[PDB]
Ligand binder design. Structure first.
Ligand SMILES: CCCCCCCCCCCCCCCCCC(=O)OC[C@H](COP(=O)(O)OCCN)OC(=O)CCCCCCCCCCCCCCCCC
Ligand SMILES: CCCCCCCCCCCCCCCCCC(=O)OC[C@H](COP(=O)(O)OCCN)OC(=O)CCCCCCCCCCCCCCCCC
Ligand SMILES: CCCCCCCCCCCCCCCCCC(=O)OC[C@H](COP(=O)(O)OCCN)OC(=O)CCCCCCCCCCCCCCCCC
Ligand SMILES: CCCCCCCCCCCCCCCCCC(=O)OC[C@H](COP(=O)(O)OCCN)OC(=O)CCCCCCCCCCCCCCCCC
Ligand SMILES: CCCCCCCCCCCCCCCCCCCC
Ligand SMILES: CCCCCCCCCCCCCCCCCCCC
Lengths: 54, 100, 476, 504
């Protein structure tokens, strides 16, 4: 039951999570200038709202 | 007699209109037009702020803003001419080769 | 206006006179060698004249400008970045069939804007310095406009930087509407008794944060960075990543230092979220990158996140300014060497049609010393000890521990581990197996070798850099 | 005075090994042997002139030697070296293992052998620097600068039969584990320095001044936990162990890298020298967790060792089980168990060095590590199966070898402190016997299970045979006469024990 070293796999889990998160984040780098402007305006909205709620 | 808030709100309205025109348009020319709208709105806000305090600094910042607007309009229209020369269309979605 | 104030202005005057002289020399004849030499002579002269400005002292040359050792340190970093850019640009521009001389004029004018941002003490001077480093970068990013990727990067950077300039200008206008004074020290003066967090002041600072965080590649204003870095010419990528980031973060450092609204808790929390997201996202997006330009763009996002962590601890700590100075020296040398190795392997410019892929795999077996420099900078940007990048990481961790910024400290550790993965992947790919000849290319190799030796020496022995950064003090 | 040269001699020797690469391909091995022998003989000289057996516990700090030179005075950082009995035993072990590592890679005649020697001596000098530094930043600096040469030789000089992607993956896993844990330790160091500066008002990274740091209960726990996470990645403590079998399997074929970097136990030294005196109350509360992690390490490493078909992975998991014993020993607070842990560290270094050298030789002769492809090797080899039998007999803790002295002195002290954990650990010794006999039966006994095991194999060279026999003689002498080793480290162990039990 232990021959595959389960503790090593459970400690290897954060590497899998990092690879999945990086692959998911790289989808936003689609190369569209209009989406880049849209993301700038979205970030402006988020920053302004965060500054207003404190 | 004129509120400062009304001038600031008018500048904000023009700024968000320019931002909307920048985002929704696929043609690069209308993107440059929206950029001109946003920078003119910012210059108008500076004029309103300078006129409220009775200072020359608002008009000076207006002069600096329109100097920037002239330079950016020149450079952007040069780039648009280059795009129309190379690709024969002004679709900004086709200029999307670099990604990842 | 005093003549001692004229002595405080010498970097600005020397760079402007170099601009005029190089322009007139181009008007006489188009000589790449002579105009490039005149440009590097003017930049070297301004770097030398920083000593005379240091002997002049420290004073407020205008309601706009203020010069102290803080400003001279930032001026020196910007001038060194510009000199390295010109040195890398000459073997690059040797292959450029169009006019090779406008490059140096734009580089010099951008260095002038960097100097203004180094010395800026005023919203007008900050706006002017931002635009003066931006518009020549519009020209330089698309200097090879016939190349498809360079034209794409030029259009992207021009549109997005015009939008960010509009955001920054609108925020400045709202701040001036509240305050009635464009001086840095008066941004929050008319408030008091706990009424520091005025909503219009905070929203104006938020729009300025949007513009400057675009300029600093901070998440979520960061998506332009890999595309613009990949599409731009490699010396232009070097100049952007070093000079633009250093000058704008220096002026942001100064703005948050003297503005009384810099002690606002809301801006601190927003900048903490931005720094956290920048570190994590920039490290995570560079995991699976086979292109060194995009990888270095994501790396720049993470390193500016670390710098922002040092920025948040400004008011609570005391060693925050020194931390920013030491980190910026290490980052300048590291990014200079990295993008310089990329530049000399991308030199000469092969044309608008041929690919400009780096192909770092197996670099040691045909070009070994540059491979050694490249892996030294990979270790330095990873923050590994024996490198000055570690010394900067140690300073950032010290100011995060002293200010009890535990979330940002944990972000630094986790993003450091992810960075270790991708940086070590690049550094070991340099020594795997893969399937110039003038003195200017040798000068570029000299520049990257010198920067690598400096980062190694100040990794093992960091005390001189610490002492000379501590020598710089502002007019508090 | 002679400790700065103790760190500097390996660095200069590796630098000259790289520099005189132009004079020949077989040149740098002699330079490597010269500098490792010089470090070893200098350590033996300082041992012989130390007079540790006539030293009485007079509190902490108490060094045989110390040296301070200001390096970063802005933070109060200095090159601060020191040595006493325990650290001297560790550096003598480091010198002996470095000499064995140089002798192990003797026939590696490659174009870039000089750079491999430079990396090896950077590793050895870094291990010695960790063992000698008493400035916290400087100790952390050596702790992390051991990493880069080890990464580069695992990734580039590693096990050639496996693909380069596997070696790169193992190297990156090892680097990420140890460097992330080192950064956590750096965070703990910085927080401790800042807490002392807030309490008093002076910048210092000196270990002797940070000892008297008034902290609340819970901050001390967090500092101890950061130190323990670093020292538990490098110990290895489960579940932070898997880098160790993947790094051993992808280590270079000769076996020198196993000796130089891994088989020196700097994490146990760090727990004894830094975790217990700086945070004694926090270590006292943490002791049951560390003891049960040690028990889990013993049995899990034994079961993992039995399950392997690769010999090198089996030996790596054996190391995991033995260090579980050591981890139980360190947190007992018992002088007898501490001395047993010192003996166990030295005996584990010698025995695992012998096992890894013999496994590298066996792989050289049979070109496979798979135990289902070998059998009946007692009738095919002249010296290797019997020496492997000796080192597997020492591995299970047979009396007459130093491993028995270490394990049973640990168990005597632990039974004086924690009886149930001691009982479970002795059944772990039964498990050790089981996996050692399993490896002996699968490798050298029975019938040949393939074609390479049916052929007579060449006998070992005289250099490898003599270094294996030197390890055998040292292990037997440790088992039958461990008294000089105990008298060497009695004062330092006594001072650490007294500081640990007189503060709780
Ligand atoms: C993912 C990898 C990285 C690890 C995670 C990142 C680090 C996490 C650290 C969490 C720290 C939580 C602190 C909670 C209280 C903070 C506010 C407070 O009340 O502080 C009290 C005290 C300041 O008051 P003072 O009068 O100075 O007290 C002197 C006594 N020390 O404060 C102090 O005196 C200073 C307290 C410092 C505490 C130690 C911080 C570092 C500890 C080592 C690393 C974290 C633990 C190990 C790793 C966990 C698992 C990853
Ligand atoms: C016991 C708990 C308490 C103590 C905690 C101590 C924490 C520090 C010490 C332990 C660190 C554990 C790190 C585990 C992952 C190590 C890296 C690794 O395994 O990399 C290998 C893998 C690449 O190999 P492969 O599977 O072949 O992938 C092909 C790639 N296309 O790589 C990849 O696939 C990508 C790797 C990305 C970078 C590594 C992951 C970093 C994640 C954050 C680490 C910091 C700690 C966070 C908390 C961990 C859990 C407690
Ligand atoms: C992509 C992957 C990465 C991202 C996902 C994974 C998560 C990464 C982050 C993990 C770490 C999270 C933060 C851990 C530290 C929390 C600190 C904290 O809450 O401290 C509270 C308190 C502070 O002390 P306090 O009591 O306030 O002191 C003043 C008066 N005494 O503290 C105390 O009083 C002491 C509390 C001690 C217990 C808390 C720390 C647990 C650490 C767990 C790991 C280590 C476990 C032990 C070793 C295992 C084997 C190696
Ligand atoms: C009795 C009352 C008192 C109780 C005290 C505590 C328990 C004591 C138990 C005593 C009796 C144990 C008898 C074990 C005999 C094992 C002999 C045997 O059949 O071995 C077969 C196998 C050989 O190993 P290998 O080389 O891998 O061979 C290929 C596999 N057929 O080898 C194996 O399969 C290994 C089996 C190991 C069993 C170890 C049990 C330890 C218990 C500790 C508690
Ligand atoms: C830790 C600080 C930096 C240390 C130096 C890092 C490496 C620099 C380059 C030195 C020369 C490298 C030569 C590599 C040869 C590889 C041969 C492989 C053969 C299989
Ligand atoms: C993904 C990054 C994770 C970073 C974890 C940092 C943990 C910080 C804990 C702070 C606790 C403060 C208590 C008061």
């Amino acid at each position: 039951l232990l021959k595959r070293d389960p503790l090593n796999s459970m400690m290897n889990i954060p590497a899998v999570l990092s690879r999945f998160a990086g692959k998911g984040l790289l989808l936003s780098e689609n190369g569209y200038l209009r989406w880049y402007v849209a993301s700038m305006s979205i970030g402006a909205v988020v920053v302004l709202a965060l500054l207003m709620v404190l | 007699m004129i509120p400062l808030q009304h001038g600031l709100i008018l500048a904000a309205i023009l700024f968000v209109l320019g931002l909307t025109g920048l985002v929704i348009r696929r043609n690069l020319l209308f993107m440059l037009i929206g950029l001109e709208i946003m920078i003119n709105a910012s210059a108008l806000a500076f004029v309103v702020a300078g006129s409220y305090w009775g200072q020359t600094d608002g008009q000076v910042m207006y002069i600096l803003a329109i100097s920037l607007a002239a330079a950016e309009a020149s450079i952007g229209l040069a780039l648009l001419l280059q795009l129309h020369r190379r690709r024969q269309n002004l679709n900004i979605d086709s200029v999307s080769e670099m990604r990842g | 206006i005093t003549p001692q104030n004229l002595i405080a202005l010498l970097p600005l005057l020397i760079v402007g006179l170099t601009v005029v002289v190089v322009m007139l020399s181009i008007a006489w004849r188009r000589n790449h060698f002579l105009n490039a030499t005149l440009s590097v002579i003017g930049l070297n002269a301004a770097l030398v004249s920083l000593w005379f400005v240091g002997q002049a002292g420290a004073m407020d040359v205008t309601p706009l400008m203020r010069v102290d050792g803080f400003a001279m340190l930032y001026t020196g970093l910007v001038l060194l970045a510009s000199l390295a850019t010109c040195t890398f640009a000459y073997p690059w521009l040797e292959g450029y069939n169009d006019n090779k001389d406008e490059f140096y004029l734009l580089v010099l004018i951008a260095a002038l804007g960097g100097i203004l941002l180094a010395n800026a003490n005023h919203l007008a001077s900050l706006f002017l310095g931002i635009e003066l480093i931006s518009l020549p970068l519009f020209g330089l990013v698309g200097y090879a406009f016939r190349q498809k990727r360079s034209l794409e990067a030029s259009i992207k950077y021009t549109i997005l930087s015009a939008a960010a300039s509009s955001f920054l200008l609108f925020g400045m206008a709202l701040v001036y509407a509240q305050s009635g004074d464009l001086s840095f020290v008066a941004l929050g003066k008319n408030l008091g008794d706990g009424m520091l967090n005025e909503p219009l002041l905070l929203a104006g600072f938020g729009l300025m944060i949007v513009g400057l965080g675009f300029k600093l590649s901070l998440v979520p204003f960061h998506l332009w960075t890999p595309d613009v870095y990949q599409g731009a010419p490699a010396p232009v990528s070097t100049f952007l990543a070093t000079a633009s980031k250093i000058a704008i973060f220096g002026v942001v450092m100064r703005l948050f230092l003297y503005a009384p609204v810099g002690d606002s808790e809301a801006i601190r929390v927003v900048l903490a979220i931005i720094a956290f997201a920048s570190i994590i996202f920039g490290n995570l997006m560079a995991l699976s990158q086979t292109n060194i330009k995009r990888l270095l763009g994501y790396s720049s996002i993470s390193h500016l996140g670390y710098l922002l962590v040092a920025l948040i601890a400004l008011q609570t700590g005391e060693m925050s300014m020194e931390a920013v100075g030491v980190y910026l020296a290490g980052y300048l040398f590291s990014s200079l060497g990295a993008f310089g190795v990329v530049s000399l392997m991308s030199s000469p410019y092969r044309g608008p049609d041929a690919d400009s892929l780096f192909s770092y795999r197996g670099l040691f077996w045909h070009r070994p010393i540059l491979a050694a420099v490249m892996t030294v900078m990979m270790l330095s940007l990873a923050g590994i000890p024996m490198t000055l990048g570690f010394i900067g990481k140690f300073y950032v961790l010290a100011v995060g521990v002293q200010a009890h910024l535990w979330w940002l400290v944990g972000a630094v550790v986790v993003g450091s581990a992810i960075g270790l993965y991708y940086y070590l992947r690049v550094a070991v790919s340099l020594y795997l197996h893969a399937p110039p000849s003038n003195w200017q290319y040798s000068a570029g190799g000299i520049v990257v070798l010198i920067s690598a030796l400096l980062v190694l020496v100040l990794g093992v022995w960091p005390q001189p850099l610490i002492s000379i950064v501590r020598l710089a003090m502002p007019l508090m | 005075m002679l400790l700065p040269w103790l760190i500097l001699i390996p660095f200069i020797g590796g630098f000259l090994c790289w520099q005189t690469e132009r004079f020949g391909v077989k040149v740098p091995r002699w330079i490597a042997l010269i500098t490792m022998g010089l470090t070893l003989a200098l350590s033996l000289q300082l041992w012989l002139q130390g007079g540790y057996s006539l030293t009485q516990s007079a509190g902490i700090p108490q060094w045989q030697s110390e040296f301070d030179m200001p390096w970063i005075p802005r933070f109060g950082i200095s090159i601060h070296l020191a040595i006493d009995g325990l650290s001297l035993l560790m550096v003598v072990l480091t010198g002996l293992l470095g000499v064995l590592a140089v002798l192990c890679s003797w026939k590696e005649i490659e174009k870039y052998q000089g750079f491999f020697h430079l990396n090896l001596m950077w590793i050895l000098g870094g291990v010695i620097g960790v063992f000698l530094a008493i400035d916290m930043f400087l100790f952390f600096f050596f702790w992390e600068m051991m990493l880069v040469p080890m990464y580069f030789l695992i990734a580039l000089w590693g096990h050639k039969a496996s693909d380069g992607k596997t070696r790169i993956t193992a190297a990156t896993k090892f680097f990420i584990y140890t460097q992330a844990s080192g950064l956590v330790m750096l965070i703990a160091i910085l927080a401790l320095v800042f807490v002392h500066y807030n309490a008093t008002g002076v910048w210092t990274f000196n270990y002797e001044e940070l000892l008297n740091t008034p902290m609340s209960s819970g901050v001390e726990y967090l500092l101890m936990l950061g130190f323990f996470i670093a020292f538990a990645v490098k110990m290895p403590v489960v579940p932070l162990h898997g880098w160790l079998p993947d790094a051993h399997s992808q280590a270079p074929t000769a076996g020198s890298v196993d000796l130089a970097g891994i088989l020196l136990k700097t994490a146990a030294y760090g727990l004894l020298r830094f975790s217990l005196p700086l945070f004694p109350n926090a270590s006292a509360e943490f002791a049951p967790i560390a003891m049960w992690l040690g028990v889990i390490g013993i049995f899990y490493g034994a079961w993992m060792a039995f399950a392997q078909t690769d010999i090198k992975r089996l030996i790596a998991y054996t190391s995991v089980s033995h260090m579980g014993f050591v981890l139980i020993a360190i947190y007992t607070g018992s002088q007898l168990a501490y001395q047993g842990a010192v003996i166990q560290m030295i005996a584990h270094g010698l025995s695992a060095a012998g096992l890894f050298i013999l496994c590298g030789q066996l792989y050289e002769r049979i070109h496979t590590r798979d135990m289902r492809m070998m059998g009946g090797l007692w009738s095919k080899m002249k010296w290797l199966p019997a020496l492997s039998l000796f080192f597997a007999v020492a591995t299970l803790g047979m009396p007459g070898t130093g491993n028995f002295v270490g394990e049973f002195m640990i168990l005597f002290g632990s039974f004086q402190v924690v009886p149930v954990i001691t009982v479970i650990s002795t059944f772990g010794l039964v498990f050790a016997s089981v996996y050692s006999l399993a490896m002996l039966h699968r490798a050298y006994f029975g019938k040949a299970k393939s074609q390479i095991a049916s052929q007579e194999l060449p006998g070992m060279s005289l250099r490898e045979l003599f270094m294996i026999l030197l390890l055998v003689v040292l292990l037997v002498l440790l088992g039958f006469y461990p008294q000089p080793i105990l008298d060497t480290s009695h004062s330092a162990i006594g001072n650490i024990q007294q500081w640990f039990v007189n503060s709780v």
